């Protein structure tokens with residue numbers, strides 16, 4: 311056993327490794343989405359910028375969990391990062407909808423992680439999740455919902471003008 | 483023979499003179515396009531600004547080739563600069579499409595020039611073309627493609643509103 | 655066909671997608687190595703810092719290739735990012751040796767990519783690889799070789815003192 | 827009853843008084859350790875500096891708990907501060923090992939305190955412990971573990987050179 315390990319259940323350790331993979335997966339989804347908008351036949355540079363930033367944030371989320379694993383004396387075990395579900399993201403509205411679904415999926419995993427930490431009476435892990443993950447998720451989900459709403463109201467995805475104007479006035 | 487000349491084939495010298503003419507031609511096409519947008523019955527000042535800048539860049543491309551010719555000990559031979567294919571450029575979208583076609587034509591000529599330089603084992607000329615021309619062309623073509631895409635998606639050329647808003651938010 | 659595509663062979667497009675995956679793989683290897691050194695039973699923070707920086711550089715390499723793909727009118731196709739070969743990296747010396755092997759493997763792939771670009775007479779792609787990848791690889795390989803040499807000379811991996819002092823005076 | 831008291835169980839009040847004593851005890855252990863390293867026959871000034879800083883931090887931990895007691899309307903009851911277990915701390919490695927054991931003991935007490943607060947549904951007290959104590963403990967334990975590891979790897983306690991170099995390059 312690690313000399314630092316205390317009150318850190320093996321189930322929690324395993325769940326943290328699963329969460330690391332999921333955060334890296336989310337980084338990959340956003341990376342794919344970003345460069346879709348950089349295509350010459352899509353050409354929405356602020357959608358590209360927005361999703362690249364979200365991608366980099368997800369990687370920071372993963373790295374902080376790796377740091378946590380070591381802080382508590384667990385051992386990092388990495389798995390393949392699966393490719394995203396789509397190669398072609400169809401439209402700005404569709405990409406925002408997929409991002410919303412992704413963030414709610416990552417949130418559900420974080421909530422299950424917190425429930426495990428609660429079941430194992432690990433208040434340090436509970437605090438870590440609450441302080442660094444749960445409100446960030448709520449804010450991300452709200453922002454994506456807001457974006458979906460505006461795109462729908464403006465007439466996307468049929469209106470290429472709506473996508474263009476949203477790119478310029480909300481994402482730029 | 484020029485006291486400086488070394489490893490510089492007469493075919494390369496001639497091809498450089500042809501490229502000088504083509505770059506000046508491209509400058510002239512963009513000059514014509516620019517002032518079309520300055521017409522009182524067209525009145526898109528940022529289209530005018532954009533194309534005038536592209537015109538001035540083409541002249542810089544020509545002057546750098548003139549400098550190259552002398553650097554290598556070749557002799558500059560100038561020809562008439564042909565007037566552009568159109569007097570009336572029809573719309574912002576049509577002008578962007580013509581610019582895209584022009585830039586791909588200039589690129590093809592540069593690629594043929596590079597192949598000649600390769601065939602004659604002239605690595606200095608190869609480097610000159612690669613370092614100062616080829617990526618600039620790729621970037622210009624990508625930018626023009628992006629512009630065409632947005633104008634089409636926004637509803638041009640039928641939508642005068644699309645042209646106006648593109649002028650203001652992308653070119654301004 | 656993409657409106658921007660010119661002189662860009664389908665084989666080159668495919669090879670660029672393969673290179674994107676390899677660069678992301680290299681990012682993952684370095685990420686794994688970094689956090690190994692952050693373990694409480696390893697505890698070499700400058701090894702951790704060094705490898706995390708290398709990880710972030712590899713991701714930048716991947717993103718630039720994604721940008722290239724779109725610039726030339728190719729289409730990005732992503733694959734799973736394989737987990738690294740090891741979970742436990744054994745020592746500072748062993749990790750440096752693995753990094754050296756990785757960088758030489760990535761270099762070989764870049765050289766094969768350049769040979770394809772040469773075979774297809776794509777001087778823009780040749781220049782891109784030469785300007786942004788090949789010297790960076792040569793410098794990385796030389797630096798890693800230098801590091802391996804010093805660790806060996808100092809008495810690693812048997813000397814934990816050698817690893818500690820190298821961490822402090824070369825990597826810090 | 828205090829005019830401010832609300833949802834503050836008598837068991838929690840008593841447990842806070844016990845924690846105040848333990849934090850002062852930890853301050854005393856580190857004070858003793860610090861001046862051991864200031865002995866002319868030990869003479870490791872950065873070990874002395876490090877432990878004196880840890881001593882002062884423990885006193886701040888105690889004072890914040892005293893403030894908490896009054897904030898919630900409990901009453902502070904003080905007990906003797908026991909002398910540390912050792913007069914002679916043997917070596918830098920041994921002192922770091924004793925500090926690690928101390929911090930894990932203080933952590934266990936904090937975890938028991940948090941469980942009491944949970945059992946009595948006192949979310950303010952739960953938050954206080956999580957926000958101001960639990961991560962500080964995890965970080966302290968990780969840092970001490972890191973220090974023990976490096977000293978062992980470098981050849982302590984037999985190597986007086988290892989202790990000297992660690993003092994200079996990690997603690998200085």
Ligand SMILES: [Cl-]
Nearest residue numbers: 315316317318
């Ligand atoms: Cl445990």
Ligand SMILES: [Cl-]
Nearest residue numbers: 318319320321
């Ligand atoms: Cl367990």
Ligand SMILES: [Cl-]
Nearest residue numbers: 327328331389
């Ligand atoms: Cl997993």
Ligand SMILES: [Cl-]
Nearest residue numbers: 388389390737
């Ligand atoms: Cl796997």
Ligand SMILES: [Cl-]
Nearest residue numbers: 389390392734
């Ligand atoms: Cl699978």
Ligand SMILES: [Cl-]
Nearest residue numbers: 411412413415
């Ligand atoms: Cl998902």
Ligand SMILES: [Cl-]
Nearest residue numbers: 426428429430
């Ligand atoms: Cl349970």
Ligand SMILES: [Cl-]
Nearest residue numbers: 428431432433
């Ligand atoms: Cl709990």
Ligand SMILES: [Cl-]
Nearest residue numbers: 448449452453
């Ligand atoms: Cl919000």
Ligand SMILES: [Cl-]
Nearest residue numbers: 445446448449
């Ligand atoms: Cl908020």
Ligand SMILES: [Cl-]
Nearest residue numbers: 456457460480
């Ligand atoms: Cl919004």
Ligand SMILES: [Cl-]
Nearest residue numbers: 475479647651
């Ligand atoms: Cl507007």
Ligand SMILES: [Cl-]
Nearest residue numbers: 487488489490
């Ligand atoms: Cl010659």
Ligand SMILES: [Cl-]
Nearest residue numbers: 490491492493
């Ligand atoms: Cl000749």
Ligand SMILES: [Cl-]
Nearest residue numbers: 499500503561
């Ligand atoms: Cl001519």
Ligand SMILES: [Cl-]
Nearest residue numbers: 560561562563
């Ligand atoms: Cl003529």
